[PDB]
């Protein structure tokens, strides 16, 4: 029935929403204290136990959560091998594979072939200064806990 | 990092968004800034309608228009912080692996 | 002088009535054990497989047994060995943290 201005209602509603956003931004921190796990997977060991002082933006990780249904396999090819491939694929003495070219199979730490046969993507474009090696990424399926991240496989 | 949004090893465009950093506090800051902009926008429209018949001072209109442009600049700062998350690729070229996976 | 959250600590308060043990086994022996238990040629115990017993750095055995815990899923790049865990109770202070221990 217009006993107060429309503009005073707009200013008071702005104060309402501008304090509701402050409640949201102060509730974000209470959600940060109960440290939610950022991703699902198998957690390792707790690096800090209870009682240790913990600071903001800490460089030291408190726990490590990793999941491995696929596993990235980082494989380093020397650049002279890629360069002789580029010299031999241009001539007719080595034809490109095509439909079967993506499949890679890895040799495990006991000389036994891994039963599944994954695929590669992004042969990298930056070599390193020291050993002159292009790293090549390959993705492998991993149903059981057979491969572990940090092994030394061949491919 | 919530999730990464680029195929690793493709020609990413200039301005194609790569990641999505958790925008919760920045969405809160943008909602606060937009809530201030709504009221000062509306008051500047009212004094715009009132100066034509001189029912308000010209100086009170200049004060309302200054508060309105300050609040538009504050919403631009909040929008720039909301654009820095969901980080855009600054140039266009071949992209390698992600040294920071999603979750870190 | 003391500042707000520096590198060094002013004291170390530590509780030792249970004691964790960080046993490291290599990845090839873990892989051989996993293949041998997956195949039919080795049977795993159900109840006695959780028990772990020490052997201290003088050769004298430790009288109380202790329950096993997890193994990590990430073998580290340097030493090439996964790490295990165990919990050993000590009412008296026979075991103290930092000592070299077999299991």
């Amino acid at each position: 029935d217009q006993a107060v201005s429309k503009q005073q209602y707009a200013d008071a509603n702005a104060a309402y929403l501008q304090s509701k956003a402050a409640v949201e931004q102060a509730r974000i921190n209470l959600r940060y204290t109960k440290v939610l796990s950022p991703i699902s997977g198998r957690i390792g060991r707790s690096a800090v136990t209870e009682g240790a002082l913990v600071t903001n933006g800490q460089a030291n990780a408190m726990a490590t959560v990793q999941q491995l249904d696929p596993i990235y396999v980082d494989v380093t090819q020397p650049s002279t091998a890629l360069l002789r491939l580029r010299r031999e694929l241009a001539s007719g003495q080595l034809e490109r594979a095509g439909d079967n070219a993506a499949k890679v199979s890895l040799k495990l730490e006991d000389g036994s072939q891994y039963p599944l046969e994954g695929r590669l993507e992004f042969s990298e474009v930056s070599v390193d200064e020291g050993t002159g090696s292009v790293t090549i990424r390959a993705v492998f399926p991993n149903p059981n806990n057979e491969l572990l991240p940090g092994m030394f496989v061949h491919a | 990092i919530l999730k990464r949004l680029f195929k690793e090893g493709s020609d990413v465009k200039a301005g194609q968004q790569l990641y999505q950093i958790d925008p919760a506090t920045y969405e809160a800051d943008y909602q606060s800034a937009q809530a201030n902009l709504a009221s000062t926008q509306e008051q500047a429209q009212r004094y715009k309608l009132l100066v034509a018949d001189q029912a308000v001072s010209k100086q009170q209109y200049a004060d309302a228009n200054a508060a309105y442009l300050q609040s538009k600049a504050a919403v631009e700062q909040a929008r720039i912080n909301l654009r820095y998350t969901k980080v855009l690729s600054p140039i266009s070229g071949r992209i390698g692996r992600s040294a920071v996976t999603e979750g870190a």
Side-chain angles (χ1 to χ4, degrees), chain A, chain B:
Chain A
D1 58 351
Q2 196 70 41
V4 79
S5 303
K6 292 179 184 178
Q7 180 58 43
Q8 188 169 359
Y9 170 67
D11 287 331
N13 200 3
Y16 162 68
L17 293 174
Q18 193 172 4
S19 179
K20 191 172 181 180
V23 175
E24 182 178 1
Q25 192 173 0
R27 189 179 292 172
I28 293 300
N29 285 318
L30 273 74
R31 191 182 63 84
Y32 285 168
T33 60
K34 49 182 77 172
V35 180
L36 299 175
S37 178
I39 201 65
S40 66
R42 184 180 297 273
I43 194 165
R45 70 184 187 272
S46 178
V48 289
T49 61
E50 73 184 3
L53 175 62
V54 177
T55 187
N56 191 4
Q58 189 181 4
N60 291 316
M62 296 171 69
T64 59
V65 178
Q66 67 271 26
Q67 61 179 354
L68 41 102
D69 193 2
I71 281 178
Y72 284 156
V73 173
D74 285 328
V75 162
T76 62
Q77 189 183 10
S79 64
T80 183
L82 183 60
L83 193 59
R84 63 172 285 171
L85 290 177
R86 288 177 181 172
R87 286 189 289 113
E88 290 181 354
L89 288 172
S91 178
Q93 66 181 356
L94 190 62
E95 185 180 1
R96 187 178 297 113
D99 56 354
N100 202 5
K103 289 184 181 179
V104 293
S105 178
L106 70 91
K107 184 180 175 70
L108 198 60
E109 288 183 353
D110 287 334
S112 64
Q113 296 288 321
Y114 189 72
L116 294 172
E117 185 178 2
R119 65 184 296 275
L120 66 87
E121 76 274 15
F122 70 106
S123 177
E124 283 281 332
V125 80
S126 175
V127 309
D128 51 352
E129 182 179 1
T131 60
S133 65
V134 181
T135 65
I136 291 172
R137 177 69 58 81
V139 181
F140 280 91
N142 193 9
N144 289 317
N145 196 2
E146 184 68 26
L147 286 169
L148 278 73
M151 291 174 71
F152 191 82
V153 300
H154 288 173
Chain B
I1 306 293
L2 291 175
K3 60 182 178 292
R4 62 173 177 84
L5 293 173
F6 68 97
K7 191 262 188 295
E8 292 177 350
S10 66
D11 48 354
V12 64
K13 302 293 183 183
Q16 175 176 358
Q17 55 94 32
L18 294 174
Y19 290 146
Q20 181 73 43
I21 300 168
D22 202 8
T25 179
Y26 296 140
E27 183 68 29
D29 197 2
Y30 178 73
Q31 288 175 358
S32 176
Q34 190 68 257
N36 197 3
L37 190 273
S39 71
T40 316
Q41 171 71 260
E42 190 172 1
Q43 191 185 8
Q45 292 181 358
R46 265 70 172 271
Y47 286 166
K48 184 75 72 179
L49 295 176
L50 262 60
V51 168
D53 293 330
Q54 202 62 255
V56 77
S57 298
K58 293 178 71 65
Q59 183 60 43
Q60 298 184 1
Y61 169 68
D63 289 330
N65 199 3
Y68 167 62
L69 293 174
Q70 285 181 352
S71 183
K72 282 174 71 176
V75 175
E76 288 294 327
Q77 287 290 324
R79 188 179 296 170
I80 285 165
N81 283 319
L82 192 63
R83 193 187 69 191
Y84 285 168
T85 176
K86 186 182 86 273
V87 58
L88 303 174
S89 67
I91 59 171
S92 65
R94 180 71 59 84
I95 190 164
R97 70 168 67 90
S98 67
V100 172
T101 62
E102 59 272 18

